[PDB]
A paper describes a structure:
The low solubility of F-tractin in aqueous solutions and its strong bundling effect on F-actin in vitro are significant disadvantages that prompted us to improve the peptide based on our structural data. Based on these insights, we developed an optimized F-tractin, which eliminates the N-terminal region and minimizes bundling while retaining strong actin labeling. The resulting optimized peptide, F-tractinopt, was chemically synthesized, water-soluble, and exhibited minimal actin bundling when used at concentrations up to 100 µM, as demonstrated by low-speed centrifugation assays and cryo-EM. We then determined the structure of F-tractinopt in complex with F-actin at 3.4 Å. The structure of the optimized peptide and its interaction interface with F-actin was nearly identical to that of the WT F-tractin, confirming that we successfully removed dispensable amino acids without altering the core of the peptide. The lower resolution of the extreme C-terminus of F-tractinopt indicates that the removal of more amino acids at the C-terminus would lead to the loss of the helical structure of the peptide, disorganization of interactions, and, consequently, a decrease in its affinity for F-actin. By creating an optimized version of F-tractin devoid of the flexible region, we have shown that the N-terminus is dispensable for F-actin binding and that its removal dramatically decreases actin bundling in vitro and increases the exchange rate in FRAP experiments. We observed a dose-dependent increase of F-tractinopt in the pellet fraction and estimated the F-actin–F-tractinopt Kd to be 8.5 ± 1.2 µM. Fluorescence recovery after photobleaching (FRAP) experiments indicated that F-tractinopt exchanged faster than WT F-tractin, suggesting a reduced affinity to actin.
Actin filaments (F-actin) are an essential component of the cell cytoskeleton involved in numerous intracellular processes, including cell movement, division, and maintenance of cell shape. F-tractin, a 43 amino acid-long peptide, is an alternative to Lifeact for the visualization of actin filaments. The peptide consists of residues 10–52 of the rat actin-binding inositol 1,4,5-trisphosphate 3-kinase A. F-tractin labels F-actin structures without causing female sterility or significant actin defects during Drosophila oogenesis and has been proven to reliably report on F-actin organization in primary neurons without notable effects on cell function. The C-terminal helix interacts with a hydrophobic pocket formed by two neighboring actin subunits, an interaction region shared by many actin-binding polypeptides, including the popular actin-binding probe Lifeact.
Author numbering:
A (entry chain B), C (entry chain C), D (entry chain A), E (entry chain D), F (entry chain E): 5 to 375
B (entry chain F): 17 to 37
């Protein structure tokens, strides 16, 4: 039976059958529960809404994400998200379809174990696997060698790879991604009085972030230009038709990827952690990592982020190195497309965790087979 | 061997210096 | 005037007057600079904090070590550490006290030269010397013959010695020590979700490493025991009272000394580099090196490390050899105690670099006189 | 000349000379305009009344507050409140006295700019500054380190500070305070038929709130006790001598600080936002924040609020942490007392915005110098 | 069928058919095995890489040499190098082609026996021979008389010959060659902080040695010149574009051939062992050995080595003797060219070890026939 | 005063008072100088080790023999060996004790002169003599007539004597002895890979030679037996506990005495030179030389050497001659015992070189009086 790929990343579920060119179910990884009274009988008023249901009802629900910084915090709601994914969106019974899950690297083994337990005992799936998202992101590009920079909703991580052979000591994970960008955008939009505080407003500021924001090529000069002229200001219309206007916030928001100290995060920026990841690699392969920076994940979609990243690494890396960034279109879906490749690769059919192996070895098996 | 003072250890090296002499 | 011994090793400065039994100033070789805004006037809010000052303020400072892999990378901050050592901790004017510095072997001559420049031109010290730490470690152990294994915060090195006469071709230095152990402990503590990422958290994982970790006698069987039973688990209380629990990480951390491939380090382990160092020695003296393994440096303090090292070398060395390891108590301070012996030894008073010799020969003098 | 401190918080102006122990002008930040016809000539019938003037005429005026949610909405009337403060209450010409204003954090920069424009161009003041109210609240306690909880008429905010160095990412502001408590008290007093609808009645329910209300230590058991017995009921006499009696409303009113969902506010309560603010702080300093919760602002005056807050944070925080709350007497005036300290501190005289700097840099200067 | 010549020296295999002017397969005698995890399926990820394969993948492989000090230590990998030599590089089936092997003199008879076993039982070759490399080096020059100095990657040896009749008592072998030069170059490049420790870095320092190093004509004065001026410094570009600069290390590295005590080797230098080899010869022939010094092997390629060798032997040898050194171009390949001559010489076709003789006499035959 | 006998042979000094049954000082004629960098203090004040001290420090010293082929090549170190002999071992002032030196025959007169100069001008000895070692070897046996075969460390010589009257034309000296046996043993131990190259290893192969080697009675059949069976193999344990195993090398080493062509030495063997020495004697005395072959010197200690020598001379000599070899126990010390007899013989007290005769005649006197 055709395999199934379910990227339970943060923020958006991407799911669909393996071998498809694009995920046929993309919806937010949200569970919402009614905030207010139940005044009006004659309706189911059902206890919980997930995905587009929750977005369609946004303003009466306390939205929550059950996966936070790539870690599943709320298994009771995550099992609802998987149920919705399989039965309502894909409309398929998982007990016929081996499911390729995926997760970020450097992630608690309790998560991979609970995902295994849930897949094999709630959904009875014939087989399962848990690929590293950055390893999947190579397949969607066609590379065999490169640093992958994945930057999602909840986590950002760097994984260098060379003809295979991921270098596990050089992997880095940052815990800074689109939610921290949304919350900082809310904090700076407070500077001119657009008070957003509800999770519905968090979900609107996520849209403002996606529609308006871009990464400055030269932050000091863009900041001076936005200070000297209104040419960088853009207007956006809230769901109630209130117009807002945004200025230096438009690039100060995604700039925090390059200057994490804006959100008080101590870590080196994404350019610096990219360089330090290449510097953890053996000196022979660094030239091909510089020649093969692969960008993936939704928070790499900002206009100009590839240009800024290339400028910053060309300033970091030795002057001879041909710094190149592979930031294609659809890099938002590249982790799923990589899973759609891998799950349909004939060499991979050896790799599944069969349910017999789980019945013999329990959740611990998924540390032995999967990377 | 137990801890011993630098005042003790020095005189061992002075004795070894006299032995090497 | 009484001589002065200042072990600017990595991680901890050990300093004190010669002839004392123990260093009267031991503090971390850290410079910390305020990370956040300067909101609250009416205080000095001073620009920099060093040592216990920086530890007492840990959670608001970007801690940095200016000596890395035994190499001083940041002379502007190292000169602050020396200033603090002399004027605030020892409370002494260096222009009266000849200072015995020490450094690791196989180390850039630019370091020894810049240390010379700084000592003679900033601190005007009457005289100076730069002993190899492992040579000092024999003086502290009353030996005249042995391999010395020094394992610090930043570097580990082997120096075989026979009635004097260090064999310079048989010296080995590993660049693997307590910082690589701390960072690997952080990486494996991520496996159950204690995310430590700040340098303050690095400084807490250093404490976790010192308090809990030990070296397994039989790593495969200890790993199987930690998998089969919780008896090896220990609980520790973070500065905020959050309890953490630690298991096979407790010995997987210091095991990387014996299996550097865990951190991706290619080199042979510390037992193998000890054996290979003895194998670089002439065949007549090897029996006395086997009979005189001296262990020094803080990362030799792990419980059971002497037993594991003896097992591993007895497996490497020929069956007749009486493999013996001299790993005494206070071997953490043995480099300083050896300097306290040497600087007060009556025959060593010929050996000082006088300031007249520096005025005649510049920084190059310290390659001619010192070994 | 002695500096001047004017806490244009919401609800009450606190103003007075620096170095005084208490603000010598405290009056409501109200502008009232005649509601009815002007029938009786032979009087000035003047167009506007402010402060105690407006309270003395309350029942014929449409009272309005020109600062709402800590934001000045009505500059034409706020400039009247400042005029009254300087010329009628303090009876002083501002062109001789540098004025320390203050405002809540995370507040629109348009406010700080318009306050700057008004101070320098209407009142010609020699110099000005705009301190964060919570930073001032430390000085009145003598702390250098702590959580500050300020809870005013219009806003509530948490600001963690450590030896200085306010952590700007961990600041939180709630937009829930004494006005929302007054309006909810009016809504629940409607449950037994005390219809209050005029602003004069809002101003009477503010007095009922201050005189009668208290915070329940164990809300479920206090609610059950008020249901089972009248012992918690209190009687109050309206300005016209109508007696009212109040019961579970007495603690249901301030309970909404701990359960904002009572007013339909989605946010976490003040105990939860206090804990989450400590959780945004670096893990080393949390023990001193737990040991140094500072409470300020009039809505922290409720009986039992310190006991309830200590219970709730001790339930939230790890069992070892010595949760301590510094909620002294006069904590209602602690923001002004902190301004009276700061404005008279000799180190602060560097910090003023001089009028020369305003003539050089316009309103934008107050973002560069002030925090 | 045309004979086959396969110089399994150390470091580089030189192989090709007899009668060719130059070896058509020259590649490093390296076997490399993947160091890291096998993360990326869909590739062969094959277990082992040899020669240029291993160089092309250098930075992910643990490179190893299976021949060490001219002694084959690792027959399982040497048999892989022979398999690669015959089937992938020369693309020929050895069972049709009699193979001339060669080895250094004064070498364990177990090696010559295992080479015989492998050639006759793994590769089924029709016939085989094992010439001494220095005897081959005469044929490439056209001499019949001379003292051959071969200096390879693993061993250096002197063999004096006179009209034939190699003098076996005057042969000397030093166990000092290009690997000891590489490791000493690494040790001295550590003196200015280019830490090379991996085998990939050893393989880069081999390139630095080949590109930059030269032999000083007057070591004390060249050392003083490099100390007084930077004119002798050269810059080289590492595979990642990091520039390094090298100075007195440039000639201190190959100087260790003339002063083995630099690497702690006790033996006389190569000039002294050349002279002592002539002094082991009968007094009549010494004049023709002085007139016919033949230099061969890659480590004789250093610029100025012939001039330095001539100076040193002219200082050692009696003043009348016409000391002459035959160090032609392509002397790196002279051992192979000598094998290409010998294997195609019509007189030599009697000399092969036939497989019938091996079936009659076992490995012991190759001590009886071959010199 | 009791005379003094000092056998400065090669390899071992034998010294002691005359009339003693055995030399009370036997130690190697070695001077060793430190090879390595002396880093500790407590060394280097003493910088040259002699005798058993050089053996006790073997692995850090460049050992040298100052007497080579029975010729003193290095008077500066030989004078150290004499100083050590007199002052440290025998603990006696030579200016009271007439010293019987001895040397091999057919030896440069410059040696006998420099020994005379040194004895009379450095040690001021009252009298001196220089007996031929083979003439001394008769006294220890009690013969008056015989061939003496002395075979030392550096030289082997035959001296026929008849009732006195050494036949000076029939003396033969071979320049082949225990050092050439050690070096050939090293060359053949290289055939199975025990690489010995240092002088410390030369000094270990001397021990291997003394412990294991023996002279084959029938070399072809012993070689065939060692080829067919391991029964002749013996295992030996190096100073570091590495076991080595030795086979046909065990008798191939001392066989070179009978077949010098193995080391490329042209001469006839020791049996042939013994026969040719008898053939230089007048035909009447040959029967008593055949009846009185006396063997002396350490390299005559090999098991079976007397049997092999008797077989070989019985094959050389005419069938009637009763070939007899006097090879007693302690024949290693027979030259010293002969000196202990001669120096205490009352007839010999005429024979001393008095210091008055040296003051009259210079070094030339020792050619006139001594044989
Ligand atoms: N066009 C866009 N521009 C900027 N940000 C975007 C865009 N599209 C998505 N994002 C942001 O990327 C994040 C979602 O990325 P996604 O790849 O779905 O997460 P994950 O990697 O966990 O699956 C969200 O924070 C979203 O706001
Ligand atoms: N009791 C202990 N157990 C384990 N590790 C320790 C202990 N004490 C110190 N260390 C570790 O040893 C290192 C410091 O050793 P030190 O000798 O001060 O360095 P150096 O040799 O450079 O002076 C640090 O990594 C520290 O964590
Ligand atoms: N004793 C009290 N008990 C309860 N509430 C009080 C008390 N005193 C003042 N308040 C309330 O606190 C608010 C005024 O607080 P204040 O600190 O003056 O505001 P700000 O922080 O803006 O200066 C009003 O809503 C008032 O009703
Ligand atoms: N042009 C050159 N200059 C200096 N060294 C060289 C040069 N070419 C090769 N070498 C060194 O010589 C060694 C290889 O010599 P080679 O003759 O191939 O070994 P073998 O004698 O075992 O076949 C290596 O150490 C290599 O670095
Ligand atoms: N028992 C023994 N078996 C074999 N060789 C020996 C034995 N004892 C000594 N030798 C060898 O004899 C030599 C020393 O002989 P010695 O008589 O001391 O020399 P010299 O004749 O110069 O005094 C050394 O080469 C030593 O190895
Ligand atoms: Mg993702
Ligand atoms: Mg140290
Ligand atoms: Mg206030
Ligand atoms: Mg070669
Ligand atoms: Mg002798």
């Amino acid at each position: 039976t055709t395999a199934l790929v379910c990227d339970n990343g943060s923020g958006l579920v991407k799911a669909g059958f393996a071998g498809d060119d694009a995920p046929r179910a993309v919806f937010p990884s949200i569970v919402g529960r009614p905030r207010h009274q139940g005044v009006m009988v004659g309706m189911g008023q059902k206890d919980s809404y997930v995905g587009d249901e929750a977005q369609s009802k946004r303003g009466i629900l306390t939205l929550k994400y059950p996966i936070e910084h790539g870690i599943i915090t709320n298994w009771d709601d995550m099992e609802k998200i998987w149920h919705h994914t399989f039965y309502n969106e894909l409309r398929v019974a998982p007990e016929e379809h081996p499911t390729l899950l995926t997760e970020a690297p450097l992630n608690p083994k309790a998560n991979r174990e609970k995902m295994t337990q849930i897949m094999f005992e709630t959904f009875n799936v014939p087989a399962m696997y848990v690929a590293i998202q950055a390893v999947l992101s190579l397949y969607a590009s066609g590379r065999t060698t490169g640093i992958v920079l994945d930057s999602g909703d909840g986590v950002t991580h760097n994984v260098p790879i060379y003809e295979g052979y991921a270098l596990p000591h050089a992997i880095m994970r940052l815990d800074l991604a689109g939610r921290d960008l949304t919350d900082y955008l809310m904090k700076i939009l407070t500077e001119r009085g657009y008070s957003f505080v509800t999770t519905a407003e968090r979900e609107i500021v996520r849209d403002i972030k996606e529609k308006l924001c871009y990464v400055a090529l030269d932050f000091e000069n863009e900041m001076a230009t936005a200070a000297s002229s209104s040419s960088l200001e853009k207007s956006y219309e809230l769901p109630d038709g209130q117009v807002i206007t945004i200025g230096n916030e438009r690039f100060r928001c995604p700039e925090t990827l390059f200057q994490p100290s804006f959100i008080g995060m101590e870590s080196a920026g994404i350019h610096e952690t990219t360089y330090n990841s290449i510097m953890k690699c053996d000196i022979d392969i660094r030239k091909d990592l510089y020649a093969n920076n692969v960008m993936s994940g939704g928070t790499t979609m900002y206009p100009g982020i590839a240009d800024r990243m290339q400028k910053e690494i060309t300033a970091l890396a030795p002057s001879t190195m041909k710094i190149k960034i592979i930031a294609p279109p659809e890099r938002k879906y590249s982790v799923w497309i990589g899973g759609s490749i891998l799950a349909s690769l004939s060499t991979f059919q050896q790799m599944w965790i069969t349910k017999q192996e789980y019945d013999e070895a329990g959740p611990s098996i998924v540390h032995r087979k999967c990377f | 061997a137990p801890r011993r003072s630098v005042g003790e250890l020095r005189l061992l090296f002075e004795a070894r210096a006299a032995s090497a002499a």
